[PDB]
Amino acid sequence: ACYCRIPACIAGERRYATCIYQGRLWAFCC
Ligand SMILES: [Cl-]
Ligand SMILES: [Cl-]
């Protein structure tokens, strides 16, 4: 299952979208 990450997805994940919450954009990583 995916995670919202800052600053970037970790190794083995790709970004598919963006999370917007708690005042930040997050990489949506799966
Ligand atoms: Cl998982
Ligand atoms: Cl980001």
Curated annotation (Swiss-Prot):
Modified residues annotated as Phosphotyrosine in this record: 21
Modified residues (ADP-ribosylarginine): 14, 24
Disulfide feature: 2-30, 4-19, 9-29
Protein name (database record): Neutrophil defensin 1
Species of the source: Homo sapiens (Human)
Residues of the full protein shown: 65 to 94 of 94
